[PDB]
Design a protein around this ligand. Structure first.
Ligand SMILES: COc1cc(CN)ccc1C
Ligand SMILES: COc1cc(CN)ccc1C
Lengths: 300, 237
């Protein structure tokens, strides 16, 4: 188990850690989160009480370094940093642990939610989407745009998701116009899987990361990317059997975790009705269809 | 964007554009089989591709053999249309390629856009105008070349005959659409109107009769009376 120590909490803020949120009051004696499960990426995120504008946060893996959070009164936000002095870090963390100034990540022993949302998410692949390579952690926020959104504006502060565009020369082979538009298998299997992502684990990792960023930050372009990546699979007549099964699992736990009250702005009615009812894979996502119908039947 | 009554003069400016109509691409007769089920027999069809400024009509004849062994023919027809329009643009010198292609039915937008990804500067647009281009097969010379064809074939016409010598393209288009609307609402009457005077003939190199200016006004009036007549017979007004 690992720890993220906080210098202090000078401004009132809601703190989230993966799928959990808690409130810290202005100048309350808060000095971090402990008992963070080693083995998974994590995200620690923030919404200021005095300005719900800009949700922001940091993707990180405790195995890659000792990180902490300090408020920056010039830039006005809680920043992640790395202490390279290990001795100093253990010393800092043990005093706050002894004064019980740290809340405990509530890692229930009967719960696999976080694993199931991050199964294919690895820091190495996150750092290719979010470019800021002087740090071992990655900052995301509500308003960061995607490379595709810039095409349609700072490239340093962008989310470098893989662009998916069904009416593009990459998606459509000359001479197979109708075939490749109505059956996306070429684009999914040869262009994206074999050519760009290399395997389905990297493709699912980007998918899962796009959902998490949509949900935790309300990042609109991440939400477009998640829906695009689903639709490409569902709109392909030929998909490996193991990807369809794993996709059904991925989506089931995303749908299960989505707040009911965010369903109107996080779920695209067109994509989901197409995917579950019209597409080639309409019958291939049993778990996801069953949860969608019992949870969000309005949308369908 | 969509083409409508507000930007109607854009059709007749000096930016090359084509209308594409696919109504008559896939044509069938429906008949009972010996066992009393129903089956279709396809007949020859055509793509109607028209420069509304010049009157140049690129009539691509669609021979029934292009459907042989194919499934979902109504859907294939939109893509076959888009393939043939793309082929036409590619066959034209650069300075003759259209800057815009306007499809008369919105179902043509994706198939054409996909076939023309190579031409990102050509705008593919729908229109809110209800154009009567489906009646193009009521023009005897066009119907004849379509039905006689034994192979795929493209035939080129000027659907304005020589009118542009005397009127603007705006007026020639207005004449054409009223003629086609009339043939679409009551074909027999429209043809009766067009030929009742044997002293006005159709030149071998033309589609419509050689009416004088004065006779065109009369003809136009009679066609409007016909469209109004039929509206009356239809709705009982
Ligand atoms: C919150 O923990 C730390 C604080 C400082 C300096 N505020 C340095 C390093 C660490 C670990
Ligand atoms: C108080 O700290 C926590 C609280 C909850 C539930 N609001 C979840 C997780 C943590 C760390």
């Amino acid at each position: 188990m690992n720890t993220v120590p906080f210098t202090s909490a000078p401004i009132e803020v809601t703190i989230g850690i993966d799928q959990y949120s808690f409130n810290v009051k202005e100048n309350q004696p808060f000095h971090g989160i402990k008992d963070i499960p080693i083995g998974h990426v994590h995200v620690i995120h923030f919404q200021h009480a005095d300005n719900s504008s800009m949700r922001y946060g940091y993707w990180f893996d405790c195995r890659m370094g000792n990180f902490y959070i300090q408020y920056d009164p010039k830039d006005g936000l809680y920043k992640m940093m790395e202490e390279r002095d290990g001795a100093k870090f253990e010393n800092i963390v043990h005093n706050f642990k002894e004064r019980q100034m740290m809340v405990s990540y509530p890692k229930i022993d009967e719960d696999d939610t976080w694993y199931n949302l991050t199964e294919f998410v690895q820091m190495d692949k996150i750092r290719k989407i979010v470019r800021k390579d002087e740090n071992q952690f990655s900052y995301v926020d509500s308003s960061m745009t995607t490379v595709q959104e810039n095409e349609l504006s700072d490239p340093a502060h962008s989310l470098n998701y893989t662009v998916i565009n069904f009416k593009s020369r990459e998606a459509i082979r000359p001479g197979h116009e109708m075939e490749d538009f109505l059956d996306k298998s070429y684009y999914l299997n040869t262009v994206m899987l074999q050519g760009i992502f290399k395997n389905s684990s990297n493709y699912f990792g980007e998918l899962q990361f796009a959902f998490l960023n949509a949900m935790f930050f309300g990042n609109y372009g991440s939400s477009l990317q998640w829906h695009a990546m689903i639709e490409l699979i569902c709109s392909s007549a030929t998909v490996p059997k193991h990807m369809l099964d794993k996709l059904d699992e991925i989506l089931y736990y995303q749908i299960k975790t989505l707040p009911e009250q965010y369903s109107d702005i996080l779920l695209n009615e067109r994509v989901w009705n197409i995917c579950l009812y019209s597409s080639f894979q309409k019958n291939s996502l049993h778990n996801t269809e069953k949860i969608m119908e019992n949870k969000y039947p309005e949308l369908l | 964007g969509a083409m409508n009554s507000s930007n109607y003069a854009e059709l007749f400016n000096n930016d090359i554009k084509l209308f594409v109509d696919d109504t008559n691409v896939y044509r069938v007769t429906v008949h009972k089989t010996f066992e009393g089920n129903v089956a279709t027999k396809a007949i020859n069809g055509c793509i109607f591709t028209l420069n509304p400024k010049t009157g140049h009509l690129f009539l691509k004849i669609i021979h029934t053999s292009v459907w042989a062994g194919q499934k979902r023919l109504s859907q294939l027809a939109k893509w076959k249309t888009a393939e043939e329009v793309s082929a036409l643009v590619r066959s034209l010198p650069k300075e003759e390629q259209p800057k815009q292609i306007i499809v008369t039915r919105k179902a043509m937008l994706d198939p054409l856009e996909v076939h023309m990804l190579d031409f990102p500067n050509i705008a593919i647009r729908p229109t809110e105008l209800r154009l009567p281009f489906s009646a193009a097969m009521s023009i005897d010379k066009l119907s004849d070349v379509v039905m006689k064809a034994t192979e795929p074939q493209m035939v080129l016409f000027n659907i304005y005959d020589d009118w542009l010598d005397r009127i603007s393209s705006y007026t020639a288009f207005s004449r054409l659409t009223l003629l086609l609307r009339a043939l679409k609402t009551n074909e027999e009457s429209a043809k009766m109107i067009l030929l009742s005077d044997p002293t006005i003939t159709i030149k071998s190199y033309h589609l419509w009769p050689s009416f004088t200016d004065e006779q065109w006004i009369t003809i136009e009036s009679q066609m409007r009376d016909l469209i109004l007549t039929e509206y009356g017979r239809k709705y009982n007004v």
